[PDB]
Enzyme design. Structure first.
Site, short mmCIF file in Angstrom:
data_model
loop_
_atom_site.label_atom_id
_atom_site.label_comp_id
_atom_site.label_asym_id
_atom_site.label_seq_id
_atom_site.Cartn_x
_atom_site.Cartn_y
_atom_site.Cartn_z
CE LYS A 203 -0.33 0.21 5.07
NZ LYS A 203 -1.01 -0.65 6.04
CE1 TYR B 12 18.55 30.64 -0.10
CE2 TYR B 12 17.30 28.64 0.29
CZ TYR B 12 17.88 29.54 -0.58
OH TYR B 12 17.80 29.34 -1.94
CG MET C 101 11.91 24.04 -2.35
SD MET C 101 10.82 25.30 -3.09
CE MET C 101 9.64 25.47 -1.75
#
EC number: 5.1.1.1
Lengths: 348, 366
Positions: free
Chosen positions: B34, B255, B303
């Site tokens: 699953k 950052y 990110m």
């Protein structure tokens, strides 16, 4: 379950950002598949709302937009070693180079394709990641001048990354701009004029118009998420609402919500998050499972809509609320929903 | 994927299935695939598990089952999580077994049997302490299944429950009571099954006719406090080094400049980040393996990238070299469990995270 993107909010946020940018052209940043909102649909919407150009990290992201029929300018600025710049050139993708090696690679691809490169140079003004440093910039300018003389490149852009995504008043922003101005003086000394220079992210766009150069590059603010959370929504509207249907009601009374951490519901939200069902907040109880979790209803039926996060217009939690609970930032919140959470759009 | 990959070693899947079959003894194995194979790829893992002796497949949704069928899987597939008002017709027409956990759901499935004309191969999911049919509703469930079975509207395949320490013995005792209540009401199931990976590997005395391992198929320990339990994690997340550079003492990184170099040193830029499943809270805590050496992450995870410290020793990393974020640990790399420890979660969530720039790839079994 669905992650409903309101393109009306995107359009509103783009219009707000252009008010702050004044005379500067706006480059909407749509990397990471539009921060989870869908690069192509957000791009189309932003351009319609007045964005001039699009920005992405990778050439692959830029080629995806091109393949979906986007013809507006697109700039890509993160390239792995070994990249073939040829496909970018044949697809009219602008390339930001961050080293002489990358420039040399681009120039070989220019000769191979016969296509002049529309080039930007990425310089280091303080982030200290991959931009060309001040000592190496003269040599890069010379190579660019030579290549431009033989019509191998068009010298479009000078760009740099800001250190702080959310700290506009920090004097490092001012320091980075002073460093950027110094790079421009170095170019003048080497007889090079860039068409445009840009340093501003969303924070700088909305809060430091005195640091705006020729273009602004807002990302997070396009999606309605505040670039300085401590100031509130900054007149933006978060575009993404994550919601799912109640799959089971069981007796207090609980609702089974059939999404879990494999769909991006951070497992650490267990026993901490709340969801909104028929106007009321219902706290999660127990662990988040792989694909489901439970909330306590304390007037809800199977099929009713439960809102996990959104702009907050209806009293629902926001992505910032999730960021607070998890110990992260809303950037990470909106790039998480997946799996059973189907991306959908509300037309503007 | 040139840039980064989640490489699934199907030879490891085969080894893990063989281990599980040994522990299962006489019982047959339903491999649970699953959530797209727990991030490893439902179809490829399904194919490999069946080839290594798994008898059947288990998934949550009928949609997951239909995806296996569309990829050419013909083995038995059982689905146990269904939204209210589901039209079970397509499942019946695709030979998908249906586990029902309520009387309302049984009614939905028997309506689909009437609409389509297709007998349903039904399993009843009962609540032993954890959804599920409760003791109060089970007598009514048995009477209905006896009725549906007599007209061959259903084939009564399975009785199942899911395990949530003596609480394990309590659930098993409740499960045996369900089997007895069905036997005394004259309703026979072909097979009964209670066991997940943990029960399969640690509580063989609680094995019935079938076991339903998921996590251990992927080689991840179902009782982490006991070690690897002879299993080999199948997923290795790795990426190419995109840049090597030197920095001076005093310089910030990533950052926010949350990390300031205490000494002159060398760094490597790894071009995957939290949008690719590298949990942002791993910033400043995780290590990677590069050319046999551990390199700590420094500064924030962005990110789509982060930085690691190679140290000021003689440079032994080049652009294009391979960095391993986690794997089975054979080469000294971190494991998924290490990540789970660092961020305060479980390896289940670790391996369902890699995405985006992290392309899923496969190493075939030798």
């Amino acid at each position: 379950a669905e992650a409903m993107v309101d393109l009306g909010a995107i359009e509103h946020n783009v219009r707000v950002l252009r008010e702050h940018a004044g005379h500067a052209q706006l480059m909407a940043v749509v990397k990471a598949d539009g921060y989870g909102h869908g690069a192509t649909r957000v791009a189309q919407t932003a351009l319609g709302a007045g964005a001039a150009e699009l920005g992405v990290a990778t050439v692959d992201e830029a080629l995806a937009l091109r393949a979906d029929g986007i013809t507006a300018p697109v700039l890509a600025w993160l390239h792995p070693p070994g990249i073939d710049f040829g496909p970018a050139l044949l697809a009219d993708v602008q390339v930001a180079v961050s080293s002489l090696r990358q420039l040399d690679e681009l120039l070989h691809a220019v000769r191979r394709t016969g296509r002049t490169a529309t080039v930007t140079v990425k310089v280091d003004t303080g982030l200290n990641r991959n931009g060309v440093g001040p000592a190496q910039f003269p040599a890069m300018l010379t190579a660019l001048r030579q290549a431009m003389a033989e019509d191998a490149v068009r010298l479009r852009g000078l760009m740099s990354h800001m250190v702080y995504a959310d700290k506009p008043d920090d004097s490092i922003n001012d320091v980075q701009a002073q460093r950027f101005t110094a790079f421009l003086a170095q170019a003048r000394e080497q007889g090079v004029r860039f068409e445009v220079a840009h340093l501003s992210n969303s924070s700088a766009t909305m809060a430091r118009p005195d640091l705006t150069f020729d273009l602004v590059r807002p990302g997070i603010a396009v999606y309605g998420l505040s670039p300085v959370p401590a100031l509130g929504d900054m007149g933006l509207v978060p575009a993404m609402t994550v919601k799912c249907a109640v799959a089971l009601v069981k007796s207090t009374n609980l609702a089974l919500l059939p999404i879990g951490y494999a769909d991006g519901v951070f497992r650490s939200l267990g026993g901490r998050l709340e969801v909104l069902i028929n106007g009321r907040r219902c706290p999660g109880v127990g662990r988040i499972c792989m694909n489901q979790f439970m909330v306590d209803l304390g007037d809800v039926a199977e099929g009713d809509e439960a809102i996990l996060f959104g702009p907050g217009i209806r009293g629902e939690p926001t992505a910032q609320d999730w960021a607070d609970l998890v110990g992260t930032i809303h950037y990470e919140v909106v790039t998480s929903p997946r799996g059973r959470i189907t991306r959908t759009y509300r037309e503007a």
